[PDB]
Amino acid sequence: AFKLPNLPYAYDALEPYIDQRTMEFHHDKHHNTYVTKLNATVEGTELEHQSLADMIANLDKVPEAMRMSVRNNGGGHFNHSLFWEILSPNSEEKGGVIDDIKAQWGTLDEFKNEFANKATTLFGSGWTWLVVNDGKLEIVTTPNQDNPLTEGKTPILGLDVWEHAYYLKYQNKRPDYMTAFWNIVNWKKVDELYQAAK
Amino acid sequence: AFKLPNLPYAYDALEPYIDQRTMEFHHDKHHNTYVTKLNATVEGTELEHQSLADMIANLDKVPEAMRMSVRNNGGGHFNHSLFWEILSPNSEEKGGVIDDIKAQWGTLDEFKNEFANKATTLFGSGWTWLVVNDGKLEIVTTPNQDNPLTEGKTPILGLDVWEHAYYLKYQNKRPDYMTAFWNIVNWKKVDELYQAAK
Ligand SMILES: [Mn+2]
Ligand SMILES: [Mn+2]
């Protein structure tokens, strides 16, 4: 069975960038619901012993009756699990991934400007991702709980821009949430995922 | 130009079903943003005097370069405009539309149960609608700001299930928001839109 992972930090560790109350709802309610529904779909099937990353990457091979729930609930579990691991109370812009971002975008600010533009223009619910595509870095968005793995791209950083991720503190001000996020990126984790994928 | 319509009631008129703070953000920020961006797209173009119902029903005829903004921001203006008008602090379950709902679904409760199931299973951002389709009533969902007019169905009642519509009071408990909504439906306005469409 899939399990709700513990947060790597206290619920208030990301203040004042993400509020404690949002971390509690987001993890204990939203993410938990995706795990519950994913397990209800795969329990007693071949997919109960398939890796989450493999079923997301190969969603087209998931049996038709199960595919929407694996896409939505499996995507929810995969995306939130990644999200908690790429946040940290002490974000420092260090690691090979920063050199390779600078190499691709010229400056870290040019990278952040593209990421923020894509995150702020995403219409409805979804995610903004930094991915590795055949050894090259790209920023992409996905709707709802869709994940770039399904399109053959490995995610190493994601921002959740579902309104539940930011509404209690920021309400409509998604751009202020985006600005806050740079203060709490776990670049140690992003670099680990990059070095494994590149 | 398109204009942000005034609410037909005080911002606190729908308490304790929808909180005043949500009415303020939802109307004064979210709806206003759709009006601003729709006007930025259409002002000074050959669409600057076209009605919004006509453009949404005929998105294919909207020029490719303006279509996403008309769909998303035009949808946002159309949808929220309808929404404010079908809420009321003085809801009474009577009218031709209520009689015809009871005739079609058997009971009003069976209608509400279907509507609630569609509203609570809608994945991501969107709306739940009561529509007229060739003189018959149907419940349909749309994603984001899409509208059933594009598919040739006239909307007479909509529930906004974007998270901004309910997160401040209800957080993840979308079903409690759906329960609250029945207490504030303007069945007189719904009946007007029904008589005009059936
Ligand atoms: Mn989320
Ligand atoms: Mn809305």
Residue numbers in the entry:
A (entry chain B), B (entry chain A): 2 to 199
Which passages does the manuscript contain on this structure?
SODs detoxify superoxide, a reactive oxygen radical produced by aerobic metabolism and by the mammalian immune system in response to infection. We recently established that a Mn/Fe SOD from the bacterium Staphylococcus aureus exhibits equal activity with either manganese or iron. In addition to the camSOD (SodM), S. aureus also possesses a second, manganese-dependent SOD (SodA). All members of the Mn/Fe SOD family are related in sequence, exhibit identical protein folds, and coordinate their metal ion using identical ligands, making it unclear why some enzymes absolutely require manganese for catalysis (MnSOD), while others require iron (FeSOD), and still others show metal cofactor flexibility (camSOD).
